[PDB]
Amino acid sequence: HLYPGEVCPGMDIRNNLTRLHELENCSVIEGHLQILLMFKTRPEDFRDLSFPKLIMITDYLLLFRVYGLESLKDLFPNLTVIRGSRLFFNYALVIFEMVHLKELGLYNLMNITRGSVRIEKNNELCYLATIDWSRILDSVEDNHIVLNKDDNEECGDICPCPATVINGQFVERCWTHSHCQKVCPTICKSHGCTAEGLCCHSECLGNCSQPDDPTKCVACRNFYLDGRCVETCPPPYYHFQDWRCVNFSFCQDLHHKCKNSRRQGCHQYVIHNNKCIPECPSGYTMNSSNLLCTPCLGPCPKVCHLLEGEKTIDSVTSAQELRGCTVINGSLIINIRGGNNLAAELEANLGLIEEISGYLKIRRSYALVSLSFFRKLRLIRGETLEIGNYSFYALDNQNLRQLWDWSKHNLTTTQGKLFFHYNPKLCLSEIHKMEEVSGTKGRQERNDIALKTNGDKASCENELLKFSYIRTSFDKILLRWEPYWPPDFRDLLGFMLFYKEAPYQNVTEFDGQDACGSNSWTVVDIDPPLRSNDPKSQNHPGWLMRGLKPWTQYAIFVKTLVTFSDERRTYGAKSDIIYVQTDATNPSVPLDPISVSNSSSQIILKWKPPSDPNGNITHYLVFWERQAEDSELFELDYCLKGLKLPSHRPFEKVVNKESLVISGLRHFTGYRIELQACNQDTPEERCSVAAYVSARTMPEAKADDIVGPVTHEIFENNVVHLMWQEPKEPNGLIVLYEVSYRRYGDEELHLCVSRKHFALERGCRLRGLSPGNYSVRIRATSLAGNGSWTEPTYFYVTD
Amino acid sequence: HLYPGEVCPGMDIRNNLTRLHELENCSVIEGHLQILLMFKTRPEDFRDLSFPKLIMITDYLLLFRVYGLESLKDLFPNLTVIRGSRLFFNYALVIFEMVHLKELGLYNLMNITRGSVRIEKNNELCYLATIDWSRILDSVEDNHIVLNKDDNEECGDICPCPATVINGQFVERCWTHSHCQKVCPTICKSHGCTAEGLCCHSECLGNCSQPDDPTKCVACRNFYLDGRCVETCPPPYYHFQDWRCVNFSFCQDLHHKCKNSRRQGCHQYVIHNNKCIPECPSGYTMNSSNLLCTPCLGPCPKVCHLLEGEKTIDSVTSAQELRGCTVINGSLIINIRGGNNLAAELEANLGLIEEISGYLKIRRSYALVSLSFFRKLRLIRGETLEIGNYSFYALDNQNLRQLWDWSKHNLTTTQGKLFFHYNPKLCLSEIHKMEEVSGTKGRQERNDIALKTNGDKASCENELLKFSYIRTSFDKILLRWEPYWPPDFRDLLGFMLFYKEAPYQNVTEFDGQDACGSNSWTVVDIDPPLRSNDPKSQNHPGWLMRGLKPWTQYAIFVKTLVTFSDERRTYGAKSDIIYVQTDATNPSVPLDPISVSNSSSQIILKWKPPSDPNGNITHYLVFWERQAEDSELFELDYCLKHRPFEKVVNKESLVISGLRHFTGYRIELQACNQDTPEERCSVAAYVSARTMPEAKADDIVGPVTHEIFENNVVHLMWQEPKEPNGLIVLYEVSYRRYGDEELHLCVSRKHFALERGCRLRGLSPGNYSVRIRATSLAGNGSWTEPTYFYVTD
DNA sequence: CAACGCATGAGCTAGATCCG
DNA sequence: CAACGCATGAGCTAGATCCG
């Protein structure tokens, strides 16, 4: 048979030898086998227990900290292959920290699928270099066998097999003193083999019974099916654990087995691509009866079944497990008994939920003010009810002033009853709005939600406020609204002006951020206005804002204020929030204008957009200047030590880019470059200060050397005079002429003619010239460097 | 008379010319006089206004943005001198931003006391450089007269007095075209002077009527008394504002006027050293009857009289008003309607209050913790009562759990009634302690303080928890305590562990109130252990803490936990806090190794204490070894282009002297604790140093002799420095002839080694001077003697 | 009679219908 | 029968009376 035994789930063994007895009949093991951490175990109870039927290993096998073993071959006589379906601690097979292990005994290993072997901290093992991992491990670059007994060549290493020469040495490879590592001809690399060199069927491995048969060898490569295995079985069966394929009726049962939330190590197995895979990946969702994965058109809920049917949420961790959940098949209860700052984290943890079936209850919430973090809520089933058929419950909460924004929020209630008691910080009109937007309209308990204990302490207002005039400037805004007086003008404390900038318009209403939290609405107060007893007067109260960032939208509103007393009147008034943007002004300076020269007429400059554009800048303004040379260098004796070597004004309206190149200019000339970032131009033309950089273009190759008639005049005193022409456009400037002469058989003797010397003499001279035939050559050395040499002018002076 | 007119309080004028009429009769003005910002003013309304009877100015006079004036002389004819007791904006006089001022006109001004004068932004002013400020200003450097009409010399400057030569020029000094600056002989500097050069009485200034009379000149220097004045007034009177003396009968009346606290311009004047001073300074305190200031033995209360009897505090600002107050003569009510973090600021704001007279009311307090910020309260007088003769009021505070630690807190109550209603988190035993420590014992109302609305929600515990075994390490601490069970050992949720370090033992107790505090007792939870049903078992639950720094005292206690229910049992139990210190470990590396050479042998070392002490370091340990230099420079031609130690103890600096001179040393130091048991010492810090490159040993002294060959190539023989500054690398050998300079040569290390000297090829016959200098790698040394040798032609 | 002038514009002198 | 041995000490294998 290929596999006549039984499947065998991965076990864990520790502190005893009692629970290894379950290995009596299983032959192939799925998962991993792990035995570890046993101390009070004598070595003698090991010579009687064994398991001959074990061959296949899926993930890994590990033994660690064992006291009593000396050669495990008596325990594992027949295992041959490990699939390595899950790598263990980036390793495939490891033995570590052994005490009595005399020898390994793993003589049946044929081919390691994936991963590496590691042997460490074992001072009792030998024959470690006689394994030939390369013939079993397809990868050797990951092996790690250091600090063992074979650290010193001291353990024998004698064994009676081909003794391969894989390295530069004739090395003998044996497992034990009674066994070597079997190697047959390599005509087939991993197609299985026999002891006579005959390769068995192509699609199986290792030990074999009859060649060229996929029905009677031991282990085959791809899959397995009832004594046979083909590379891809037909779709009466669907692949499983990448070593089998089976009918859907088998693994439809496993999904049902632990659909009961009893053991969280399983998987609700799903069919996809002929695989009964644990989970179909993202962008795919489960179907009800077909057990396939639907392409998940758009976002798909990833339903999140609640345990126990009910749950309470009190801290970050209590809700952290709900992150990503969208639909709840139970009931939820919230109670933040105190807490510092959770309003900034609920959206990051639960602000993506939409559907729930149970009932929602809020109680004893201390620092809660709104329900905005419940973002995508639309419907509650209310399938289960609180005692008294209550679907929504609110009780004993001392800061709740709002629930939702019905201008852009929708919520539906299937059934149940609401409970609003001891909630003194929320007005009755808001819960009337709750009822109107909800499904219930007249389902009142009588006594229904409390109408007297809720909102009594909070003076909910019913009066609006409107502006009178708005003013704009670059930094300062002015406000002044229509004046107000309470029924008792004596009873009045003034107004508060809450504000903050906003790049959008999805700004929250006053959420009453009173406990710990993020940036609230920074605010100043205003003195109450002076009574005038006049219909027409300056009773319109205003206030100034000064420190503003220009060109920025800003949202503001004003709120009244009054004392608290026995009478339930003078609730004050509240304006409405609007949006107003500030004006723009001069922009900031551009950033890092980088100019680079490549050719003698090409100069490119690139910069960065200004840090503060202050509105949509229209274009960039550019300017340059052709710099001049140093006039003081004209009068330097350069043959003395010390020489130098360097490296309106028209404009354009450069638009819609970040760099510009300029051509048609002088060669090897310095240039001062300035550029202004600038906002909208034709009205109030205002630009920033120009960023100033300097740049010099490349020189011209021929500009340094001069060609022309080099004539000579001979004087009576053997002082020959020399006439020639200077470069018209030197690279920067000519600084010296490398004048020199050569008689035949004599080296290049060079003299100097400085700039001023050449200017005054219109040439040079050679005092004290020996009679002979001399060749005079000149190199026009400009400041850009040495030029080329002239023609060596021949002239012979006789005795 | 001397000062026949009237005293005249400092006055402020704006928006009109109306409020100047109050100065009809006053001649001497105290304080300052500010007139500014009038625009709807014709220039013609000033020619008919004057005050000819003004003499004295205390602080300063300021003209600012006046429209219509052109010459102040029509208004101020007799101003002479100013005391300048307070410098306005660090100046004595400033006229600024005038529009029509044509000529200045201050001609009667004689002497300034202190400060300087500044004129700015006035393009209508002339004769400005014709003043001679130095003869009125005792200081001139800080003058600032810039950007005026005299920015350009264009306004004429014709003017009819000496025209002094104070500068390098004969400059005329004159005020107007009708009057010039008046200067008399300086036989007396400012002792009063007439127009005939007759100096008046020594103790007066300015203009004067008859010479040498302390009774009929105009203004005097120090003080004033009834038409006379002496430099030190007799003590029937007390000096006031450093320009008069007067008896206490006057300034006590002003003290009694201000004790009616109606204006905030007060200075509650007290008598001290014949000066009825505003306030006798720190280290002093006034006495009631005698009006003197008591030496203030110890911290004296500086009583803070509360206004309008009562006050409420809700934010940081309302409390900052009473910062620095200790005794309050009223009643206070506190309502913290929320807030974020306030417990850490009440100490810094009001932690100096100890006594209160009225009553205390607390209501609607939300985010409170305790009243520990009331550090030193010991008595309430209760001289004002709440309705129903109530003195202490606590109501509708849904968070309060503790008031004071009465083991170390002393507090008594004089009279009144206490109130406790609707405070569901504070147990009644604390109120029992309040009653027992307070003055009252049974003064109850019936209904008195509510016994059901308070502490019902929070289960106050009545059981203690005791530790069983403690083990400590350098890094970790293990704890395990006695077993415990509720009457129903099902209802239970485990325990909490609150711990934190504390360098002292004045640690705040856990309070159970929600403070939005940056620091709180970091706490972990514990899983309740296994029920064993056996009295002798492993039921003792424990826990390990490991993330701790060595050698640090740590506070710890454990708290029970159980679900809330309807039955009023299973309150739990609470351990008492204790203190435990972790063990010590190896120290850290020392810091800042500094070595300096002050001789060729002395090497002074200085270091810094290490960052991590890990306990009191018992001593140090320093090791030094003999190190040296390299040898790759030996072949480079330079004409081209155990180790001894000592247990240093209880000091921060060290010197290694009495050792071989000019030797390189690598020295290392370690600091650590006790040695013979558990020999623990940290790592060392290495230093590298050289003694100073010497000045005489690098140079070599010896006979620089020469051997003459027949080919005019004279050999040179001398000796190398036996101990040079490291390694001699180049000898600055040179030869100098008569009429010739010190012509030089060079020799490398190997050349001198192979030749045992040098030579000179192609030498002119003459008396040469051969001088050599040692130029090693560390620098040049001294020259040898210039040797004389006279080879003939 | 509906911005600017006869200031400055947030550095011990007021604080943008604050002025007419 | 009251620290150590037949581990390590917070890097997918337990979590310091955790094993005796």
Residue numbers in the entry:
A (entry chain E): 1 to 160, 169 to 655, 756 to 907
B (entry chain F): 1 to 160, 169 to 649, 756 to 907
What did the authors write?
To understand the basis of this aptamer-induced full phosphorylation, we determined the structure of the IR bound to an A62 dimer linked by eight thymine nucleotides (A62D-8T) using cryo-electron microscopy (cryo-EM).
The head of the IRarrowhead is composed of the L1, CR, a portion of L2, and A62M, while the FnIII-1~3 domains are located perpendicularly in the center, forming the stalks of the IRarrowhead. Within the binding site of the A62D-8T aptamer, we observed density corresponding to the size of only one A62M molecule in each protomer. Each A62M molecule binds to opposite sides of the IR dimer, positioning itself between the L1 domain of one protomer and the FnIII-1′ domain of the other. The distance between the membrane-proximal ends of FnIII-3 and FnIII-3′ is ~42 Å.
